[PDB]
Amino acid sequence: NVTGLFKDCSKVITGLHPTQAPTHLSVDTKFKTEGLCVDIPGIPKDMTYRRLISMMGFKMNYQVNGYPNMFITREEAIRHVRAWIGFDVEGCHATREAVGTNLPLQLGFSTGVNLVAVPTGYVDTPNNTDFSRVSAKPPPGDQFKHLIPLMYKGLPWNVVRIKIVQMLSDTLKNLSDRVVFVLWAHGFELTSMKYFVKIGPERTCCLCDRRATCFSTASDTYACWHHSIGFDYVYNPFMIDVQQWGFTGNLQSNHDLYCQVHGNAHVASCDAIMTRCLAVHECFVK
Amino acid sequence: AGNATEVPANSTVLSFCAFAVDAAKAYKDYLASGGQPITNCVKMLCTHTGTGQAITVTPEANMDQESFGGASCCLYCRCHIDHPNPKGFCDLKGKYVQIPTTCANDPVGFTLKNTVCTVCGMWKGYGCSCD
Numbered sequence: 532n533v534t535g536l537f538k539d540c541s542k543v544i545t546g547l548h549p550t551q552a553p554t555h556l557s558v559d560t561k562f563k564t565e566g567l568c569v570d571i572p573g574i575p576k577d578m579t580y581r582r583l584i585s586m587m588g589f590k591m592n593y594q595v596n597g598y599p600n601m602f603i604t605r606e607e608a609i610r611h612v613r614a615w616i617g618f619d620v621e622g623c624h625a626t627r628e629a630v631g632t633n634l635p636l637q638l639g640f641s642t643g644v645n646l647v648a649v650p651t652g653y654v655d656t657p658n659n660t661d662f663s664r665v666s667a668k669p670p671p672g673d674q675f676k677h678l679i680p681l682m683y684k685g686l687p688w689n690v691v692r693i694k695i696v697q698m699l700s701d702t703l704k705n706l707s708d709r710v711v712f713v714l715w716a717h718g719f720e721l722t723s724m725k726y727f728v729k730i731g732p733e734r735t736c737c738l739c740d741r742r743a744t745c746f747s748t749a750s751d752t753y754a755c756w757h758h759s760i761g762f763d764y765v766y767n768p769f770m771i772d773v774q775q776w777g778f779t780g781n782l783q784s785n786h787d788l789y790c791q792v793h794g795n796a797h798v799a800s801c802d803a804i805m806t807r808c809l810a811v812h813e814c815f816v817k
Numbered sequence: 818a819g820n821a822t823e824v825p826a827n828s829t830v831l832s833f834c835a836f837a838v839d840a841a842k843a844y845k846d847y848l849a850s851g852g853q854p855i856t857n858c859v860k861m862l863c864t865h866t867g868t869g870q871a872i873t874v875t876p877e878a879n880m881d882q883e884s885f886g887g888a889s890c891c892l893y894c895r896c897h898i899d900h901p902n903p904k905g906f907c908d909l910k911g912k913y914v915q916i917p918t919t920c921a922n923d924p925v926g927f928t929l930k931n932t933v934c935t936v937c938g939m940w941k942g943y944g945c946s947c948d
């Protein structure tokens with residue numbers, strides 16, 4: 532039994548030296564014997580590898596005292612409707628030196644904002660994990676043609692995450708003490724949040740008594756939506772997957788049952804607007 | 818396409834620590850709330866006649882220890898996150914780490930909580946002959 536979380540997407544045929552492999556599964560077969568691994572004299576470590584590690588398959592189902600649940604119930608989400616921000620991400624595929632994972636390309640929100648990122652991945656090396664630009668391409672097909680020009684209009688992730696925090700803070704500071712990301716088929720949105728979200732115990736802001744919604748890697752400080760200028764991470768966001776509420780077909784077909792003012796323009800922000808809109812009609816209309 | 822590195826028993830703990838502001842504190846808290854330690858480490862077959870030093874080029878477990886591949890006992894390597902060093906590089910990856918047998922059920926937690934003596938090369942409280 533294995534998982535796809537942290538799958539090695541490199542094209543290297545062999546596994547790793549016992550000192551460099553993060554896990555027993557990832558050690559090369561040549562070192563495996565008698566239920567464990569052996570060091571083989573004369574077989575050296577590899578000092579030049581770059582192995583892309585997939586961030587698909589996170590499971591946020593822990594129950595740790597003092598840490599809030601990220602995923603919330605429909606009833607809790609309804610009480611926090613003012614915090615709702617629809618969120619959708621269109622990805623590009625790892626290519627060339629790696630294959631088998633999706634990287635965030637266009638991040639869209641129900642505010643109408645689309646942010647484009649440079650295709651970036653988590654590349655294991657002999658010394659660390661290098662968060663870096665990786666070779667990528669949009670998926671093939673006429674429905675993914677619009678992503679082609681976005682491959683050369685991306686911003687580095689350190690800039691993108693600052694923009695997400697600024698956008699959420701400007702939108703929500705006078706509406707809610709939190710954010711509830713409204714999602715449809717959450718897997719890739721949760722992978723994308725690895726790039727701009729941090730979690731921990733509930734905290735208060737550095738300049739007031741409001742709960743912290745943002746974190747800064749510059750000073751290791753916390754801020755609410757009012758005091759987050761320059762902050763780079765969203766801290767303890769909440770989220771809900773609308774698809775888990777009994778719907779059977781795709782997002783557009785379910786959205787269109789209740790609404791006709793949101794024509795599908797086939798962009799991450801339009802999917803984000805449609806997801807929030809569908810959740811609003813389901814919980815509040817009639 | 819690709820080759821799996823992990824098993825389902827570690828999915829929850831690794832996801833929790835990969836998102837945390839303070840990964841070492843999250844791992845400690847996860848254990849205190851009843852979670853299972855990270856498994857699937859690289860445990861070595863050795864002769865248990867080694868020097869007993871904490872971090873070595875080849876397995877050096879003595880009769881009170883077990884030898885593991887270094888990257889597999891490092892929370893930052895396991896979660897593919899930043900190392901809390903100034904240059905962001907790892908001191909365990911590329912080495913073998915000797916862990917006291919009594920602590921061998923949780924090698925990642927052991928390395929997070931303990932310190933190596935720079936004079937004798939052995940773990941403080943688990944072999945250090947300095948004081």
Ligand SMILES: COC(=O)c1[nH]nc2c1CCCC2
Nearest residue numbers: 908909928931932933934935
């Ligand atoms: C001399 O400082 C240390 O004790 C030390 N240096 N690196 C590590 C440790 C202990 C934990 C494993 C990695």
Ligand SMILES: [Zn+2]
Nearest residue numbers: 736739755758
């Ligand atoms: Zn504040």
Ligand SMILES: [Zn+2]
Nearest residue numbers: 790792793808
């Ligand atoms: Zn609508």
Ligand SMILES: [Zn+2]
Nearest residue numbers: 891893894907
């Ligand atoms: Zn490490």
Ligand SMILES: [Zn+2]
Nearest residue numbers: 934937945947
């Ligand atoms: Zn000593």
